[PDB]
Copies of this chain bind each other. A is one copy, B any other.
Amino acid sequence: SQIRQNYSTEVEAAVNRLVNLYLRASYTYLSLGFYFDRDDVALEGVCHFFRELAEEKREGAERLLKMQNQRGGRALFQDLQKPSQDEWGTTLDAMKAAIVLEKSLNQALLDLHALGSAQADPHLCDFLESHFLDEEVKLIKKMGDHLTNIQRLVGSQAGLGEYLFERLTLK
């Protein structure tokens, strides 16, 4: 590549893996969204929340792919593994699973920053810092908040709690 400069094959490879993680997160959230749109679940605000996350994660992957090209790396695509579940249980189950997922994405971002740092690739480190690390931290805080409110509510009368959360907190 005529443009490639200070961009290691290790970072290129990790970037392609991170794109796959993001597309997979996006796929997971798509399945979460349409689960809550079922007539027997019917929590529209939960559906909108996860469908918005499907979009965000897809955008994350595209920004990674745009960056890969800017550096002269080569995008390599792999199979996208289907989500870990077909049914997601209650809002509480679903938000717990979403937090697990975001934490693993965040861990992958931190591992990539550490690689970039080891490879002395400051553009990589800045790119993650600017576009991904802060947004992951903000998102995980939001989910933890949600989880605290769902839990507070589904003490007595789980059904009432679940309806109230979706109506009064979710968009």
* Docked-complex contact B107 and A5, CB < 8 angstroms: yes
Among candidates B79, B86, B134, residue contacting A127 with C-beta atoms closer than 8 Å: B134
Q: How far is the CA of A146 from the CA of B163 in the complex (A)?
A: 11
Give bound CA distance, A44 to B169, whole Å: 11
Q: What size tier do the contact residues of chain A reach?
A: 35 or more
A134-162 residues at the B interface, CB under 8 angstroms: 134, 137-138, 140-141, 143-149, 151-153, 155-162
Known: A79-B82, A122-B129. A157 touches B159 (CB 8 A): no
Q: Which residues of B contact A161 (CB under 8 A)?
A: 159-160
A122 touches B125 (CB 8 A): yes
Given contacts A42-B149, A78-B82, contact A3 B126 (CB under 8 A): no
What is the distance, in angstroms, from A84's C-beta to the closest C-beta of chain B? 11
Contacts of A141 in B (CB 8 A): 3, 39, 69-70
Interchain CA distance A62-B77 in the complex, whole Å? 22
Q: List 16 A-B contacts (CB under 8 A).
A: A1-B40, A2-B99, A2-B144, A34-B65, A42-B145, A70-B137, A122-B129, A126-B129, A126-B133, A151-B159, A152-B162, A153-B160, A153-B163, A156-B160, A157-B160, A160-B164
